[PDB]
């Protein structure tokens, strides 16, 4: 029972990591395959041209991407009618944002996704964009074109 759930979530993880990190591979590994309940579950990942390492030893961006593939693998195993992500892309490395935004875009053909983001690639792929500003907050439905000027305005004041 534990094992059937584990293999399905591990399979999802390795496949999603592979799609978000081209030429990369990763595995969830039981610390005690024999007696699983007496050990933990480690994450080992290997981006192209890198040696295998456990999560904590990776780069900031690698850690964010790996954690994210892990949450996406659990979500695919037990889906919900909607997803709400708040700045999950902020700490990613640039090269990785587009694969995240493409994956979200395609699973949205089937579920609802609400993503709070400051990334043009995320924005461009959305069916709809909402802008928020302030004290009192205000919300407005936006076109990509004005959404894109507002982003450029924000990035100028805040950077990365």
């Amino acid at each position: 029972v534990f094992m059937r759930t584990f293999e399905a979530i591990s399979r999802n993880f390795s496949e999603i990591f592979a799609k978000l990190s081209p030429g990369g591979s990763a595995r969830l590994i039981l610390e005690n395959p024999e007696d699983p309940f007496s050990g933990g579950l480690e994450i080992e990942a290997k981006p192209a041209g890198k040696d295998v390492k456990r999560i904590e030893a990776m780069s900031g961006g690698e850690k964010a991407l790996t954690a994210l593939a892990f949450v996406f693998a659990i979500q695919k195993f037990k889906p919900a009618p909607f997803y709400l992500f708040d700045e999950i892309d902020a700490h990613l490395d640039d090269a990785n944002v587009k694969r995240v935004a493409d994956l979200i875009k395609e699973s949205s053909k089937e579920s609802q996704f609400i993503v709070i983001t400051l990334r043009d690639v995320m924005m461009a792929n959305a069916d709809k964009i909402i802008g928020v500003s302030m004290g009192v907050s205000k919300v407005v439905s936006l076109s990509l074109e004005k959404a894109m000027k507002i982003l450029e305005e924000i990035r100028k004041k805040q950077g990365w």
Partner: protein, 147 residues
Amino acid sequence: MPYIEKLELKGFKSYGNKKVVIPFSKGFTAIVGANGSGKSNIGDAILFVLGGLSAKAKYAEVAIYFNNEDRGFPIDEDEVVIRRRVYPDGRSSYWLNGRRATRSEILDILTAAMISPDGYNIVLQGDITKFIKMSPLERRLLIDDIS
């Protein structure tokens, strides 16, 4: 599984007395705003109305509107609206389509639609750090619970 049509906020954190209506695509919606604009309060309004935090204009109110045409919620109506208003003395009330409901009944109703304020489908700021820093033991324990 059903979907969020909109969220209405009134007197909640940075959202003032003039009710604010936030519309969502049935598909993909992106939310753009500066740090401090109130965009992160959106995630908070959603945890508030879906019930994670028990109680333990002068009321904060959040209402969420779901399209239930697929009937993911055990309620025979095309729209399901969950409203919750917190008072100054700390009291909290809920309504389900205009009718009073308890928190315990709203949770049972959301669980039935595969929704939970504690679900993996809500990834706020802090949730990614959680996944990064989890001990390997805790990470196997999440798998035990899911199984």
